[PDB]
Ligand binder design. Structure first.
Ligand SMILES: CC[C@@]1(O)C[C@H](O[C@H]2C[C@H](N(C)C)[C@H](O)[C@H](C)O2)c2c(cc3c(c2O)C(=O)c2c(O)cccc2C3=O)[C@H]1C(=O)OC
Ligand SMILES: CC[C@@]1(O)C[C@H](O[C@H]2C[C@H](N(C)C)[C@H](O)[C@H](C)O2)c2c(cc3c(c2O)C(=O)c2c(O)cccc2C3=O)[C@H]1C(=O)OC
Ligand SMILES: Nc1ncnc2c1ncn2[C@@H]1O[C@H](CSCC[C@H](N)C(=O)O)[C@@H](O)[C@H]1O
Ligand SMILES: Nc1ncnc2c1ncn2[C@@H]1O[C@H](CSCC[C@H](N)C(=O)O)[C@@H](O)[C@H]1O
Lengths: 340, 344
């Protein structure tokens, strides 16, 4: 039993395996193989790497079962195929060290400082805090928006169906990304108009995305800062995966700006985790919660915490709806908040 | 569609950087030792590790999720069978090997730049810590000492089998080049009372070899010399040992080291290499092999070598591989080998 406990511990503690996975995604190793380069010299050329070092990386990729080896010819496994760039779960991009998230994940190398201080480590590594770093790096800004929106044609169908749009005229989507939630509601409730509030760079991609859905006459995009007064009032105000980016004091500020922008009868809709789930759900949550810590100083929140957050902003949680996810099996929640 | 959820889970697990950093953080904070020393509540534990209670609880939740800790009473956390291996006195020493303040786990941060190493073939350690590996240790006595203690963590038994894998009947003197704390020299000395030995090592390490050999009662049979194995060796020997030295070096340096050794061999002398006669395997052997080979890459620009590579290295130094013995390990289930080289 000790040999077994020992193998398990060494596996769990190993840094080399996820960096090998991320290296392979970054070099688009699987895409090139699927595009014919099954040999070492050809793969090394396409990835622009040394053939002997590439071979040493490939060896571990075989050991963990992402690839398998005719002699000197390698093919992806079923698991390996998920690193193809056109796979629906987009795992290649999520593991790509040149794109925003896997890049930010380096913050985990300073996890002890984060546990010691409760403060994010991203800045100590990259020179500026997360959104400020992206603000100065249009490549990262763009890749971040594409990752979060990787699923946007379907990801917002369930939450949009979980709210009654009958007496809503206007929706404001605060930090709404490329506008996917706004678009989903528009398709569902054609009498509804919307505004998306977003940061520089992102607003241009939102405008394009919405124009390409044919929604340009129904959803506006405004460039702004949701710590400042909101650009207009609305019957529903949406915060989809925004509040987990912020520590309690900032999250209360954001909620306060939303409450002040609400029309009479209006509601604020928080789309996130109502944090609790099973053994596979639990590791998504622990990973996302710790990401928020090291990237941003944010956190996932239980219902008891939402209740306190709501009250501090003069709000109350009116109801909570649990929602299935379509591309990755994870349970999400829509919280509906009303003035207290 | 169950097989697709299956594959997606596997990939996400294999790709995850947070899990090994959480394991390393637990080891560095000595979390499991404090728990075993009485601190089961978060408040108590946060105090002993000098961390913030709410953030520690978030770390602990992943530690429970991956099966390193369990909550037996509310707010009370205890280690599982797997978590117990992080107690500081467990024989495999995995706490220390995962401690981010100690040399190896600290060095493992070099993997965050693995793409550079695959592109260039060069180590990334220096780009991160400002100096190459052995120079960085030369300037940081704390890191030098923890490195030596990691490599020697089972030295009492780690060298018994290689020492018995060679006949000492006609050996008078042994030189152990880069011999660490002297453990190999000591195993041979216990096995063959007629043999005397010299350990050649770097600054800092020589003090702890000297103390270790003294404390084995071997002071009058094994001495220690501070020196550089790229320079002429301090004396001639019948057997010269390179134990986990050559894998730290690229071929051109490995050939220089072997050449210094060949020049210092008495007539009929042999060079003994203790390392891996590497081969592609199926068992869990393969993930130890790949981790070690890739560490040597990103830390040092070194590598594990197959028999064919060993043959080439030896010929370049005017040597030939005469025999290879497979060796059982006593602590970690990983087969090693002893290569015996002679003048070509
Ligand atoms: C892989 C699961 C999930 O996609 C859930 C979750 O992603 C879900 C919902 C997400 N959302 C836009 C609806 C999208 O549909 C995605 C494909 O699936 C999630 C993830 C990751 C992030 C985030 C996630 O929300 C973030 O929000 C996030 C952020 O807001 C700022 C910085 C970084 C991140 C994230 O890294 C993912 C996660 O939990 O990984 C452990
Ligand atoms: C965990 C297995 C092993 O202990 C084998 C291997 O450790 C073996 C042999 C080692 N040796 C002194 C005989 C000792 O008995 C240890 C407990 O078990 C090994 C390990 C690691 C290193 C090294 C290893 O040799 C190094 O040599 C090394 C180095 O020379 C310079 C920098 C770093 C390292 C290492 O990180 C380990 C390894 O392969 O991890 C994947
Ligand atoms: N001060 C600020 N003002 C406006 N938007 C901000 C902001 N700080 C961060 N954001 C935006 O908040 C978003 C969080 S992630 C976007 C989530 C999106 N609602 C979705 O569910 O897909 C990012 O797009 C980021 O650009
Ligand atoms: N130029 C040099 N001269 C002498 N020793 C060196 C050296 N460069 C590295 N070393 C030593 O080589 C060793 C590699 S690890 C030592 C392993 C030890 N022989 C064992 O089997 O446990 C380190 O102790 C390091 O101090």
């Amino acid at each position: 039993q000790q040999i077994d406990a020992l193998r398990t511990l060494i596996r769990l503690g190993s840094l080399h395996t996820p960096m090998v996975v991320r290296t392979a995604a970054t070099l688009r190793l699987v895409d090139h193989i699927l595009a014919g380069a099954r040999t070492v010299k050809a793969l090394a050329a396409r990835t622009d790497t040394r053939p002997e070092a590439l071979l040493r990386l490939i060896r571990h990729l075989v050991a963990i079962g992402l690839l398998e080896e005719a002699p000197g010819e390698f093919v992806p496994t079923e698991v390996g195929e998920l690193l193809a760039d056109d796979h629906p779960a987009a795992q290649r991009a999520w593991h790509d060290l040149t794109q925003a998230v896997a890049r930010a994940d380096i913050s985990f190398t300073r996890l002890p400082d984060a546990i010691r201080t409760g403060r994010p480590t991203y800045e100590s590594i990259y020179g500026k805090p997360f959104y400020e770093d992206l603000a100065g790096r249009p490549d990262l800004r763009a890749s971040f928006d594409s990752l979060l929106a990787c699923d946007q044609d379907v990801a917002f169908d369930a939450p949009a169906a979980a709210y009654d749009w009958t007496n809503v005229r206007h929706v404001l989507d605060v930090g709404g990304g490329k506008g996917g939630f706004a678009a989903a509601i528009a398709r569902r409730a054609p009498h509804v108009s919307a505004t998306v509030l977003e940061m520089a760079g992102t607003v241009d991609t939102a405008r394009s995305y919405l124009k390409d859905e044919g929604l340009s006459d129904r959803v506006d995009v405004v460039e702004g800062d949701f710590f400042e007064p909101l650009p207009r009032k609305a019957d529903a105000i949406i915060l989809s995966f925004v509040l987990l980016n912020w520590p309690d004091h900032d999250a209360v500020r954001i909620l306060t700006r939303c409450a002040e922008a609400l029309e009479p009868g209006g509601r604020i809709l928080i789309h996130e985790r109502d944090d609790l789930e099973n053994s596979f759900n639990e590791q998504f949550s622990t990973e996302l919660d710790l990401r928020m810590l090291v990237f941003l100083g944010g956190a996932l929140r239980t219902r008891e915490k939402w209740d306190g957050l709501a009250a501090s902003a003069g709000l109350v949680v009116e109801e909570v709806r649990q929602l299935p996810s379509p591309t990755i099996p994870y349970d999400l929640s829509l919280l509906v908040l009303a003035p207290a």
